[PDB]
């Protein structure tokens, strides 16, 4: 830091680290100390490889939507430097991640989520149109453009609000495009899809599972699988949703997981008392019967069905009543 790339941009910050190495803040001295964000990925083989997919796939966006109208992040050059890739990117603000952790996991108000919603619903929908899925949705890929505050007061300590809640989508080194490889084992483990977990293929809708999940978090300020084990998880869709359909049942090889033809769990176990305490049927969760809450919940619920095929499209999830206020 205070280290040269490219011989214009100096390093000031670290904004990120990762799997994949650091993305930081750096001045630009050729662009009249104007500052950008640098991913600088490790210097090894899956990472430089997911790099060269995340340039690709940005370059073929960037061409389609050069104004980032569907939201995704602009990725203004890259190069290398002692064999680290280097992305150069628009800077952007905190991840929502960041920004609710630093307002003590005190959840977003419901007219911010159904804005930040609608724009990774618009995101992603765009690119399940370029017949890509981004596999990694969850808050701390979901960045704001500046992350700036009103100081406010509450009876219920100083918190920050959002006065412009406009998100970007960041993070496409793992975006798959529907004629390639599928890797078996996609997504953050909390905002990892059912079909995922059993093994039975996956494509665009394991995406719109992450954004369930994704939209509960911004609600809750809390995960509803607070969970890293596997069979505890599928306990606690359970616990929340209802039982696995019996045909993922039938087709998963999982079979582990499984005795006769229902899940392995033991609901009076120590970890059964842990699910039972920590998650219960998903509407129960609602801090208000009102119709707005309804309207997201109906939304949550039709994004966490089950059945990848059955579950809603983000072409229909945009029309979603939910979204009205918004024009
Ligand atoms: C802070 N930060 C983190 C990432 C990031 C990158 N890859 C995978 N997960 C991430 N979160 C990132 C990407 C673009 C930009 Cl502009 C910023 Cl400021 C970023």
Same mark, same amino acid.
């Given at each position: 830091?205070?280290?040269?790339?490219?011989?214009?941009?100096?390093?000031?910050?670290?904004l990120?680290e990762?799997?994949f190495?650091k993305?930081? &803040?750096?001045?630009?001295? =050729?662009?009249?100390? !104007?500052?950008?964000?640098?991913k600088?990925? @490790?210097? +090894? $083989?899956?990472?430089?490889?997911?790099?060269?997919?995340?340039?690709?796939?940005?370059?073929?966006?960037?061409?389609?939507?050069?104004?980032?109208?569907?939201?995704?992040?602009?990725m203004?050059?890259?190069?290398?430097?002692?064999?680290?890739?280097?992305?150069?990117?628009?800077?952007?603000?905190?991840?929502?991640?960041?920004?609710?952790?630093?307002?003590?996991?005190?959840?977003?108000?419901?007219?911010?989520?159904?804005?930040?919603?609608?724009?990774?619903?618009?995101?992603?929908?765009?690119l399940?149109?370029?017949?890509?899925?981004?596999?990694?949705l969850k808050?701390?890929?979901?960045?704001?453009?500046?992350?700036?505050y009103? &100081?406010?007061?509450?009876? =219920?300590?100083?918190? !920050?609000?959002?006065?412009?809640?406009?998100? @970007?989508? +960041? $993070?496409?080194?793992?975006?798959?495009?529907?004629?390639?490889?599928?890797?078996?084992?996609?997504?953050?483990?909390?905002?990892?899809?059912?079909?995922?977990?059993?093994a039975?293929?996956?494509?665009?809708?394991?995406?719109?599972?992450?954004?369930?999940?994704?939209?509960?978090?911004?609600?809750?300020?809390?995960?509803?699988?607070?969970?890293?084990?596997?069979?505890?998880?599928?306990?606690?869709?359970?616990?929340?949703?209802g039982?696995?359909?019996?045909?993922?049942?039938?087709?998963?090889r999982?079979?582990?997981?499984?005795?006769?033809?229902?899940?392995?769990?033991?609901?009076?176990?120590?970890?059964?008392?842990?699910?039972?305490?920590?998650?219960?049927?998903?509407?129960?969760f609602?801090?208000?019967?009102?119709?707005?809450?309804?309207?997201?919940?109906?939304?949550?619920?039709?994004?966490?069905?089950?059945?990848?095929?059955?579950?809603?499209?983000?072409?229909?999830?945009?029309?979603?009543p939910?979204?009205?206020?918004?024009?």
């Amino acid at each position: 830091s205070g280290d040269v790339l490219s011989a214009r941009y100096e390093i000031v910050d670290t904004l990120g680290e990762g799997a994949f190495g650091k993305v930081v &803040e750096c001045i630009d001295h =050729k662009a009249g100390g !104007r500052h950008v964000a640098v991913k600088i990925v @490790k210097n +090894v $083989d899956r990472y430089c490889e997911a790099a060269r997919s995340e340039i690709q796939v940005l370059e073929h966006l960037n061409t389609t939507d050069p104004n980032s109208t569907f939201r995704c992040v602009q990725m203004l050059e890259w190069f290398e430097h002692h064999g680290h890739i280097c992305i150069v990117f628009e800077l952007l603000g905190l991840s929502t991640y960041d920004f609710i952790k630093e307002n003590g996991f005190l959840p977003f108000r419901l007219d911010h989520i159904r804005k930040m919603a609608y724009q990774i619903c618009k995101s992603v929908n765009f690119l399940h149109s370029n017949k890509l899925t981004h596999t990694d949705l969850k808050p701390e890929n979901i960045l704001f453009v500046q992350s700036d505050y009103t &100081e406010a007061y509450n009876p =219920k300590r100083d918190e !920050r609000t959002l006065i412009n809640p406009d998100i @970007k989508v +960041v $993070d496409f080194g793992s975006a798959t495009y529907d004629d390639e490889h599928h890797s078996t084992l996609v997504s953050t483990r909390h905002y990892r899809a059912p079909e995922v977990i059993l093994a039975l293929g996956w494509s665009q809708p394991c995406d719109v599972w992450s954004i369930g999940c994704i939209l509960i978090e911004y609600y809750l300020g809390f995960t509803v699988f607070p969970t890293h084990d596997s069979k505890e998880h599928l306990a606690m869709m359970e616990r929340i949703l209802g039982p696995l359909p019996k045909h993922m049942i039938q087709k998963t090889r999982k079979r582990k997981y499984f005795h006769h033809d229902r899940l392995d769990w033991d609901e009076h176990s120590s970890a059964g008392r842990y699910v039972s305490r920590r998650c219960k049927p998903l509407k129960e969760f609602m801090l208000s019967q009102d119709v707005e809450h309804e309207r997201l919940f109906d939304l949550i619920q039709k994004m966490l069905e089950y059945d990848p095929a059955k579950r809603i499209t983000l072409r229909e999830a945009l029309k979603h009543p939910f979204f009205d206020l918004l024009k």
